[PDB]
Amino acid sequence: PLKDRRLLEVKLGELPSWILMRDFTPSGIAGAFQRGYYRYYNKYVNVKKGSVAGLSMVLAAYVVFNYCRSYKELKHERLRKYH
Amino acid sequence: PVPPLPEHGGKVRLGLIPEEFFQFLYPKTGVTGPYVLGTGLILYLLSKEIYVITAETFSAISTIGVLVYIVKKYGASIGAFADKLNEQKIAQLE
Amino acid sequence: NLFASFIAPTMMGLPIVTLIIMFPSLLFPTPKRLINNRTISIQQWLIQLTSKQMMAIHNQKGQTWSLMLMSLIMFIGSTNILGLLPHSFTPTTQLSMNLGMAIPLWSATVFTGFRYKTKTSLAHFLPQGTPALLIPMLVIIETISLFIQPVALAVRLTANITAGHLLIHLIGGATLALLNINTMTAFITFTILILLTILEFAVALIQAYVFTLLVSLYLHDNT
Amino acid sequence: LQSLIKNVWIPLKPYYTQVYQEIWVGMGLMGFIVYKIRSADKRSKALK
Amino acid sequence: PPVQVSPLIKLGRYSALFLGVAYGAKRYNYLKPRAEEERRIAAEEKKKQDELKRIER
Amino acid sequence: MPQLDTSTWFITITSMIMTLFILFQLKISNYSYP
Amino acid sequence: PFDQMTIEDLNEVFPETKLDKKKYPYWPHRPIE
Amino acid sequence: AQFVRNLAEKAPVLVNAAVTYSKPRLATFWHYAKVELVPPTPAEIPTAIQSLKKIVNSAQTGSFKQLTVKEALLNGLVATEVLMWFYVGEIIA
Amino acid sequence: DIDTAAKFIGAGAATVGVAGSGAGIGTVFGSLIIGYARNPSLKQQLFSYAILGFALSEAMGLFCLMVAFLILFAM
Amino acid sequence: DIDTAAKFIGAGAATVGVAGSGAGIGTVFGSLIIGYARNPSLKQQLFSYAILGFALSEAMGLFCLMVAFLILFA
Amino acid sequence: DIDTAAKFIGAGAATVGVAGSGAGIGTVFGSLIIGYARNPSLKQQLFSYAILGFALSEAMGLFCLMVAFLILFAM
Amino acid sequence: DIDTAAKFIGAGAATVGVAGSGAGIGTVFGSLIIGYARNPSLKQQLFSYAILGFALSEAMGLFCLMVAFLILFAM
Amino acid sequence: DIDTAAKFIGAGAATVGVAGSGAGIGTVFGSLIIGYARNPSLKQQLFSYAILGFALSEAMGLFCLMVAFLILFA
Amino acid sequence: DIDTAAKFIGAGAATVGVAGSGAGIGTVFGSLIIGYARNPSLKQQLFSYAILGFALSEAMGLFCLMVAFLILFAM
Amino acid sequence: DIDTAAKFIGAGAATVGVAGSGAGIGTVFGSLIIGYARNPSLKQQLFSYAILGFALSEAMGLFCLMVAFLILFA
């Protein structure tokens, strides 16, 4: 009953239908990053008894980010050659 | 003209990963699918050396040990601390 | 082999490192309701406190810089903590950032001191009623140890930070290497590492206070 | 850019004009110095 | 409260397990000699470099 | 000393500026009084 | 109530809590007594 | 000194208590793991092979292409689950 | 080799800047034990002003060790 | 090369300049402990008179390390 | 070998940081003597800060010493 | 030439005559702290007799710096 | 040999430290003097604390001398 | 020749002797600042003892400085 | 030669473990002064203690210098 649905709702056959019904302009990129931040915020943070997990996630994410950034310079000391 | 909040949002396992994952996975393996899933993910990363081990490993271990110590010892103290500040502003105004 | 962590990163040929710097900006969100959650109430209290404490001495004119000083100290206290993590980058140890954060402030203070209070600012070069035997040998010293302000004001912080990262890297490396030999030495050095880690958690804020306090009283003088 | 200016020029105006007149000069000096030093090292390595 | 396997997976698992066990033993056997010899010949090379710097210090 | 490979100084400085004199002066400018 | 309100709502209910912008144009819009 | 040694004796009692608390949680894990004391039955092999052939049927004609995402995501994640055991066997190797 | 031993020497020399810190440390702790012995009340601020100097001495101690390494391992 | 080994020697020697600063810093902050314990009603001025000296005595070793760097890389 | 020479020399001329330890020790034990002669009551708390200083100065001592034995031969 | 080598080394190990000025000024300013505490109405004369000391410490601590700069540029 | 020189060079330079012993014992018996001269009822107690500090710093210096020696007879 | 090397080395080394001068002078003025802080009916005699101590320390440093200049311009 | 200059400079270095003993003597005497100026009646014992401290510091310096003599004639 709807053209645009949550990408999980849509099927594989109409997969490209979803890919083409949606927009791509940078404004529609900010209007996505914002939605992500605000889902996280209003679901795990803006609550009267926020916990560690309300924060630890972004930290342990930034961690993996800056690990991926560094992969190149770390292929030079693998303790074993044939992995 | 503003909305209120819940009492506590999405509950979480290990303090890091959400549970909704677990339930979404309940139908097929139920309970002991996610844990072995992660164990395998990690033994894989380690085996093929997608994650080589060095000093920074132990640095991370130490920082994390410190942090969990701190929280598991001071958490609710800080929580009541903050709720106290809130009720205190409420009163000092009220 | 290990200055690596200070090398400026770009995952590819693009300008990334300007994102390692604005990330903290959102570990300190802004409130819109009157009451709010914990993570905001806490920092709010913290800031009320620290201001009421440090901006006491200053006169009324000098009380216009509260924003700048507390933002400075907040930014730096964030950066120097975050940099602790396993594989994170400290955008301060890039000496250039420290120079660009030090100089303008010191210069603008001196300029407020010489735009107004000209004779008196000039006078602070000669402590009151010193022996008239040595005047030049004193108004040389004061005027050389003035220009020395920003240089140290930056370099102190810079190298202070750097040394901790370097020391932890090296201790952990020797930890693994001794683990090759034996077990107990590794635990020795690991506990050593815990101590060092705490001490760095500490200096990383001590230096912020130092910095924005030096500046505060430099404004106290030349206001 | 209208949202940008209406987010970062309504509040931050009285600061850049009344107070911070004296820091921009310092930043110009900073630019002077960085130019000088980058030029010097560019020169010295152009040699080698 | 255990949840009975949707048998497809109970099948798919242990097969692959023993496949991997065989793969591992095979890799070990097939790989040992090549590395042994490359390292021993590199040892010849390093002894030669040692005597080189001995005579060409 | 990689703090002396001057190539990158311009961007580091400019971004430091952008941050220290824009974002925080927005956030902290909104904090409130008891 | 309180939690459903904002700072402007306090401007609304209590004008004496108002942080006036004339005698103290800057932040924190008042002195530190 | 001797008091620290006495504290160690109390710590040993505490360690026994730590073992005592761990065992019921472990017993719940054991209840899930107590299903098989011998290798699995070859009775449902028919069910599994037939489900496999039905998957092949859904595949060949191009009818499974009417699925929703979440289902295929789940399927692939459990596929990779099964997969990790291959590297596990390598570990044994 | 010669540059190597020279690095070694420069390192063994730069090691010594720690004595200022060791001194300042013992000094300020003595000062603290005293200012408490004759005023056991305001322990809190005494301890605060103890560690704030502790830090401002270890800073320079580690300046020196840092330059030592900076030479030894990375020129 | 000797012509640079000597640079290494000189810088490693001059490193130790800041030992006097280590001292002066510790000394001053102990004296501040004391003069705050005696008449606790002057913390303020007795702090403004301490970090001033901190600045002085740090500057006068940071100069020396700057000179070591200069000798090395110039 | 010249590197052997510079190694032994680095060890020696870097084993000097002990001066910090010594001076701070003297100063702390003296401050104890005095603060105690004044008030003989709080001996426990006083000796506590005393041990704090004792070990915290031996700290930098062993820092310097482990750096010495770090670059003695093993590097 | 090793001539310039030891010229450099001499400047470098001669600029050490400033830790004096360091500790001297530290002690001076602490003494001023106290002698202001016990007598807060002599501020003026006190600061003057403090500057008299700070100067003639800095001067004779700086002569070593100046000697290094000299011996290097000219001789 | 060149190294045979560095032997004695270092085994001699490895005693620069007893400076600490000097300054310590000085300050130590100074504070002891002042003690006995402000409250003579503590003589033995503070004498014990003094011999404590004495032994401590003397040991620091003398084990530094042992360092010197083990360098000598490497 | 290397004579210049060793002479520069020994001179820039011997010139350490001014550290003690700075330190002394500082301690002197500190003690004086105190003594006057408590007891201002002594200005003249105080200042006199002060100048005497200053001169003594400065001279015990001047000896080494002057003999360093000797070793340089003479040998 | 090589051992000649070696021992030369080894002793010229070990001869610096004396400034600490010197300053220690000085400080112990300053402390004696103050103590006496508080309690002018226990002069005798103050002085006994002080002369002992002098014996000790002088002993330490003399050993640090006997080191140098042995280096000379090792």
Residue numbers in the entry:
A (entry chain Af): 5 to 87
B (entry chain Ab): 1 to 94
C (entry chain Aa): 4 to 226
D (entry chain Aj): 2 to 49
E (entry chain Ae): 2 to 58
F (entry chain A8): 1 to 34
G (entry chain Ad): 126 to 158
H (entry chain Ag): 1 to 93
Please give the exact wording used by the authors of the publication that reports this structure.
Adenosine triphosphate (ATP), the fuel of life, is produced in inner membranes of the mitochondria of eukaryotic cells by an embedded molecular machine with a rotary action, called ATP synthase. Mitochondrial ATP synthases occupy the inner membranes of the organelle and form dimers via specific interactions in their membrane domains. Each monomeric unit in the dimeric bovine enzyme described here is an assembly of 28 polypeptide chains of 17 different kinds, organized into a spherical catalytic globular domain that extends from the inner mitochondrial membrane (IMM) into the mitochondrial matrix, attached to an intrinsic membrane domain by a central stalk and a peripheral stalk (PS). This membrane-bound enzyme is a machine that transmits by a rotary action the potential energy of the transmembrane proton motive force, generated by respiration, into the catalytic sites in the extrinsic domain.
The structure of the dimeric bovine ATP synthase is consistent with chemical cross-linking data, and the attribution of subunits is the same as in the dimeric yeast membrane domain. The bovine structure differs significantly from those of dimeric complexes in a tetrameric form of the closely related porcine enzyme where subunit j was misidentified as subunit k, and subunit k as a hypothetical protein. Also, porcine subunit j was built as a polyalanine α-helix in the central cavity of the c8-ring, whereas the cavity is most likely to be occupied by lipids (see below), and other differences occur in the structures of subunits b, c, e, f, g, and A6L.
